Amino acid sequence: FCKKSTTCEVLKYNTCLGSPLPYTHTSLILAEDSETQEEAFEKLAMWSGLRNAPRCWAVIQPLLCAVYMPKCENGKVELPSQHLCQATRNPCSIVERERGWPNFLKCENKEQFPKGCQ
Ligand code: NA
Ligand SMILES: [Zn+2]
DSSP states (O other): OOEEEOOOEEOSOSEETTEEOSOOEEOSSSOTTOSSHHHHHHHHHHGGGGGGSHHHHHHHHHHHHHHHSOOEETTEEEOOOHHHHHHHHTTTTHHHHHTOOOGGGOTTOTTTSOSSOO
16 A cells, blocks of 8 residues: 555666666556656656746655656555655645646545655
8 A cells, every 4th residue: 555566667767857766667557647658758847847946846856756757666666655745735836826736646645645655
């Protein structure tokens, strides 16, 4: 329940939004707007507008990477934490005005963002 069972695929990129990754396997099961890694790349660049607000970017960048390019290992993908999600709501509240959060990026989604597994 802190992880989701899935089939891992080899990462086509070694970088998520500037950050080098310490893993080479991923899954697209968490990003409900992407079916391929090439689509996840496109959607990730779409979120890169939040760079102009450092206090938003500091928390939203690790979260988006945990959703779009998460670590897959031994048939399981890791789930992003509820604490990390809630930290984004306030400094990134501009999203609510401009487009709103997708269901897979809402904190009320307890199966996507469970608490405990930090
Ligand atoms: Na998907
Ligand atoms: Zn491998």
